[PDB]
């Protein structure tokens, strides 16, 4: 295994928790993205925090059934009650 | 008060088969009068033949199966156990136990035990979980003792011990249909077969999933110095008003607020958290127990559908990912799954 | 019909809007052409954003 | 004698930390057991180092 | 993929970052070679310390 997996699916999942309430380290963020990066099925959160990199670029628009998937997505990694609102 | 379908349904007194030993007590089982343990006065020439611990334990006999054997033996195999055998006596019944630990192996109820040695807690798991892999998938079981498996363990063993539990074959007949409920002889079929039900998906998940729960709450309970409220199966007992007093999971609110419980040794902080809404699905899962007939009010349980299809499907994902870190904290291996 | 380019860019305007959305060349050449339809005209990008 | 891996863990480290020894899979996995056995949280390569 | 090797070596300066990793000597002029290639500048371990 390249990456620990653990680890990456810990600090996704504290980091996105904080962000959603409103401690961490660079390289905490950087063991986040690779998780992302890792998973295959994150490719939509893939291209936009890619995007977001620098200027805020472009939330891109998705088709709804591609929106739940992504608010599935972000569920299983706390589930929790989600809208468009605070994953932008 | 037993009586006959004559023209006189005569009162019958329960005739008692086997004297009921009246010092009803095990040392390793204080809070149990089911529970019996005793020491037998061996050939005192043999230091050795000293050691052989021997528990009776007491039960109603509608445990025993159709065949007059206890549903927990058919998942027993490999035994650790020196010996076992059952005992009929009228509606009670009894479970005696022969174990011969070695010059120093030294068992202990499960119950109440907070151990930190996660080596012994290891133990414990490979026996448990080896158990109850002889579940067949479209097979399912519910334990109407508790929420959980009693057992005792000594530093080289962990013993099982008899449960108060439910065998169930469901049957998923296959749109290719290409063990049935009629295994008897062919003139025997004729009359009659197991009191089987319909399998399915839902249901192999939701028996899966429940013996998920049981393995995490005997985990919990040898982790637990205090008690663990969770085998509780009490009628007037809901979980709702449990997990309200517990209150949920400080790192998440999805998960209950199992780290702030009472351990042993080394606390495992939120690790013991798991999601509520799965848990509460279980316990109404496990309600089956009293009714274990009427299957379609509990066999999908846990893996129905309260849009709330999704909901029920993420949310048991989520309890999979609960097991799949669970395993993890522990080096296992799902291929029991 | 003619301007639901521009319309769609309107529903854009509507959200975040921290973010202006990227859109092809042949994208942004239609949109200047019905822009220009509609105020009937030069127009660029500048006036757009 | 269970941890004699610990044991020249140990000892590497006494003075240099030298690096962290690679090891074959199974080799890791049966260490692993053994911190654990030793320890409570979760462990991996990461923790032992 | 070339560059993994240095990717690597980024992965364990993640640790206590009181490790010196340790490389046979053809893992080292290959990581080297790696380094020079991606700088296109000669190169050295100190430049890779």
Not at chain 2, 17 to 40: F, G, L, S
Not at chain 2, 204 to 222: G, K, P
Not at chain 2, 256 to 265: E, F, R
Request: hydrophobic share 35%; proline share 4%.
């Amino acid at each position: 295994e390249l990456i620990n997996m653990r680890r990456y699916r810990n600090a996704a999942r504290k980091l996105i928790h904080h962000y959603s309430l409103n401690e961490y380290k660079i390289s905490d963020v950087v063991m986040t993205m690779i998780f992302l990066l890792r998973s295959e099925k994150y490719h939509s959160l893939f291209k936009l925090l890619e995007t977001t990199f620098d200027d805020y670029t472009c939330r891109p628009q998705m088709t709804q059934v591609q929106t739940d998937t992504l608010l599935d997505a972000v569920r299983s990694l706390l589930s929790t009650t989600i809208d468009l609102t605070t994953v932008d | 008060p037993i009586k006959l379908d004559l023209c006189a349904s005569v009162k019958l007194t329960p005739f008692k088969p086997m004297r009921p030993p009246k010092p009803m007590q095990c040392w390793i089982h204080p809070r149990r009068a089911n529970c019996k343990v005793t020491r037998p006065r061996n050939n005192y020439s043999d230091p050795d033949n000293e050691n052989d611990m021997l528990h009776m334990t007491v039960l109603n006999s509608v445990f025993l199966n159709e065949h007059a054997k206890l549903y927990y033996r058919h998942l027993l195999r490999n035994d650790q156990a020196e010996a076992r055998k059952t005992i009929l006596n009228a509606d009670s019944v009894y479970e005696c136990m022969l174990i011969r630990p070695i010059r120093t192996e030294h068992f202990r109820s499960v119950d109440e035990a907070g151990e930190h040695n996660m080596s012994v807690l290891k133990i414990i798991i490979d026996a448990v979980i080896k158990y109850i892999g002889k579940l067949a998938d479209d097979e399912y079981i519910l334990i109407a003792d508790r929420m959980y498996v009693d057992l005792i363990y000594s530093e080289f063993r962990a013993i099982i011990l008899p449960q108060s539990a439910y065998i169930i074959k469901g049957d998923y007949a296959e749109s290719d249909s290409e063990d049935v409920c009629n295994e008897l002889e062919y003139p025997w079929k004729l009359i009659t077969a197991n009191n089987c039900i319909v399998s399915t998906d839902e249901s192999r998940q939701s028996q899966y999933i429940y013996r998920t729960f049981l393995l995490y709450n005997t985990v919990l309970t040898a982790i637990l110095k205090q008690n663990n409220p969770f085998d509780v199966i009490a009628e007037n007992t809901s979980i709702s008003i449990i997990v309200r007093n517990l209150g949920s999971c400080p790192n998440n609110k999805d998960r209950v607020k199992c780290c702030d419980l009472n351990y042993g040794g080394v606390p495992p902080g939120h690790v013991m958290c798991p999601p509520r809404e799965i848990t509460k699905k279980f316990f109404h899962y496990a309600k089956w127990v009293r009714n274990p007939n009427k299957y379609k009010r509990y066999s999908e349980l846990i893996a129905r559908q309260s849009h709330a299809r999704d909901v029920s499907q993420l949310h048991l994902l989520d309890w999979e990912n609960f097991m799949g870190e669970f395993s993890s904290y522990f080096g296992l291996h799902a291929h029991n799954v | 019909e003619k301007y639901h380019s521009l319309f769609k860019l309107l529903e854009t305007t509507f959200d975040d809007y921290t973010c202006r959305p990227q859109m092809t060349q042949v994208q942004t050449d239609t949109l200047l052409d019905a822009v220009r339809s509609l105020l009937e005209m030069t127009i660029d990008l500048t006036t757009v954003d």
